Amino acid sequence: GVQVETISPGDGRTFPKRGQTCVVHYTGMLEDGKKFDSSRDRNKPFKFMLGKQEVIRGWEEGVAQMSVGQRAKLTISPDYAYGATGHPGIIPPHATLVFDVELLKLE
């Protein structure tokens, strides 16, 4: 469903836990088009919680699988992204998403 291609490993022992928030900064791109979902947010990156399903799976599964201080290039397939019905304009149907996420810290 989702793949995790690391570039800059992290410690390898601290990950997000159940009851924590993940503080991540990413750049979302598509196979070969453009950015649809980036995190070029002024002062605060993006922040979500594990076990509430606020972010698609590819992330939840992906980001989790990442450790505090690690950065990767994840590849999400429809099954884990926005199924078959996402939104016309941002996420066309069957549109594999590709994120470049950096788990920064937990809060």
From Swiss-Prot:
Keywords: Acetylation, Cytoplasm, Isomerase, Membrane, Rotamase, Sarcoplasmic reticulum. One of its GO terms (molecular function) is transmembrane transporter binding. InterPro entries: FKBP-type_PPIase, PPIase_dom_sf, PPIase_FKBP_dom. Inhibited by both FK506 and rapamycin. GO terms for biological process: 'de novo' protein folding; amyloid fibril formation; heart morphogenesis; heart trabecula formation; negative regulation of activin receptor signaling pathway; negative regulation of transforming growth factor beta receptor signaling pathway; positive regulation of canonical NF-kappaB signal transduction; protein folding. GO terms for cellular component: cytoplasm; cytoplasmic side of membrane; cytosol; membrane; ryanodine receptor complex; sarcoplasmic reticulum; sarcoplasmic reticulum membrane; terminal cisterna. The modification N6-succinyllysine is found at K52. It is a peripheral membrane protein. Residues 19-107 form the PPIase FKBP-type domain. It catalyses: [protein]-peptidylproline (omega=180) = [protein]-peptidylproline (omega=0). The modification N6-acetyllysine is found at K52. It is an enzyme of class 5 (isomerase). SUPFAM superfamilies: FKBP-like (SSF54534). It is found in: Cytoplasm, Cytosol; Sarcoplasmic reticulum membrane. Its EC number is 5.2.1.8. Keeps in an inactive conformation TGFBR1, the TGF-beta type I serine/threonine kinase receptor, preventing TGF-beta receptor activation in absence of ligand. Recruits SMAD7 to ACVR1B which prevents the association of SMAD2 and SMAD3 with the activin receptor complex, thereby blocking the activin signal. May modulate the RYR1 calcium channel activity. PPIases accelerate the folding of proteins. It catalyzes the cis-trans isomerization of proline imidic peptide bonds in oligopeptides. Belongs to the FKBP-type PPIase family. FKBP1 subfamily. Interacts with TGFBR1; prevents TGFBR1 phosphorylation by TGFBR2 and stabilizes it in the inactive conformation. Interacts with ACVR1B and SMAD7. Identified in a complex composed of RYR1, PDE4D, PKA, FKBP1A and protein phosphatase 1 (PP1). Interacts directly with RYR2 and RYR3. Interacts with GLMN; rapamycin and FK506 abolish the interaction with GLMN in a dose dependent manner. Interacts directly with RYR1. This is Peptidyl-prolyl cis-trans isomerase FKBP1A. It comes from Homo sapiens.
